[PDB]
Write a protein that binds this ligand. Sequence first.
Ligand SMILES: Oc1ccc(C(c2ccccc2)=C2[C@H]3CCC[C@@H]2CCC3)cc1
Ligand SMILES: Oc1ccc(C(c2ccccc2)=C2[C@H]3CCC[C@@H]2CCC3)cc1
Lengths: 10, 9, 230, 222
Amino acid sequence: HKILHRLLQD
Amino acid sequence: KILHRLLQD
Amino acid sequence: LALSLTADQMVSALLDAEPPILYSEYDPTRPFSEASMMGLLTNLADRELVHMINWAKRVPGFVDLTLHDQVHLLECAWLEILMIGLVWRSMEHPGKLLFAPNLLLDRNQGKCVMVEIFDMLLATSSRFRMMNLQGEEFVCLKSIILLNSGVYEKDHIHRVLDKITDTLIHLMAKAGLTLQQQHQRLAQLLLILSHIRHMSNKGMEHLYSMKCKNVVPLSDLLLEMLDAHR
Amino acid sequence: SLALSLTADQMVSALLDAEPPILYSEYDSMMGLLTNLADRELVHMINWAKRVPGFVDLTLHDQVHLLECAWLEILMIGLVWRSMEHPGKLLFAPNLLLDRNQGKCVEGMVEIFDMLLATSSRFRMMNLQGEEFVCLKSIILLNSGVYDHIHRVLDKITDTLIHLMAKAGLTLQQQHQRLAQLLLILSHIRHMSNKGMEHLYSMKCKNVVPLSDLLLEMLDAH
Ligand SMILES: Oc1ccc(C(c2ccccc2)=C2[C@H]3CCC[C@@H]2CCC3)cc1
Ligand SMILES: Oc1ccc(C(c2ccccc2)=C2[C@H]3CCC[C@@H]2CCC3)cc1
């Protein structure tokens, strides 16, 4: 996935 | 510069 | 001298300064080739620039600036000004961009050359329609764009900007908006200016992508206005 | 929404509490240091964004887009804010204080440096307050989409800005003038971000700088 995408849900 | 000439009057 | 106007006198001056809506040289009796669309826009924009220049001179406070700063402001703002005009004209025509009364651009046409720019221009336009942007507000915003284009004579621009702000507030207050509504409306309108700045920079890139590709027959004036942005 | 559930003072307090820290430049070359700094700043920025009232209320799709659109703007207003106590200098980090002359050996950056310095000077002359700064930065984030809830939160932050100015003793006239000037500076920040984005992409194309994975993805959104 996109890093920004993962960081926002992590 | 063309803008100079047009900016007169 | 521009600091001695009333809000009504400021509006009056700005309305008088308004350039006319121009026509394109599009022939309706003949089939229009899609590959000539940029030719019509370039020709149109080039003619709009002359009217814009004389409009700037009739913006209170502008002539008070030196010739150098008048040039720098016009060089920085010209595409922004063309865009807010375009956005304003396209309000009563949902889904399309009214470059001219005889030049309407639809989204699928943008797919022939500019789709991303198109959608942003429409979004800005519909938002003005959603907010019921008034003509008096429009001329204020456009004059603000002109005076706020230069990033890097100083205090004068500041005082005129405050003057147009008071004018805008006075217009909203005259319309019957509460104090809170005036602030919120003022905020939303100026935040839309950031979008106009954004679209201008993207459009400038798009103009360079085509000028280098020999796809847009530009005038000496447009080449001069375009080269100002690196 | 939480943002619409807060008072003006509660909004300010929440934004101040959400603030990311000032980071230091690190070794592992000017662009190399900037890239490493920005990359670590982005991680804190994302965490900051999740702490901005109203932002979490958005779908994750909307959150991605806003951050993809605003990230360089947010980096820049932060840089501009940090540099206010250093006339003619950019405080990228406490151990990385640069003037316009350092932005020469990279091409296209010295022009951006001049604009950042001028923007920092404007905030300095306006006596910009920290409370106002966190409001503007949140506005930048929520307005980045040139693409009703967001509008409501934007109105909330607008009222909050007006509240701060009223508390400071500014008259109603001074309030809408100051508000206008601050928001007009956001147009300059948008402009600088667009140019910065151009510079970064050209440097990536020329393969002169190694941008991080996150920066690559963020930049590829533009
Ligand atoms: O009123 C306007 C506003 C903008 C334009 C022009 C334009 C400007 C200069 C030369 C050629 C086209 C453009 C360009 C190209 C596509 C349509 C619009 C918007 C973005 C940049 C043309 C007329
Ligand atoms: O806080 C900041 C602000 C800006 C920067 C960076 C930056 C951003 C991303 C990657 C690498 C460098 C930049 C670049 C290069 C010049 C300095 C500034 C401003 C314009 C683009 C870095 C940190």
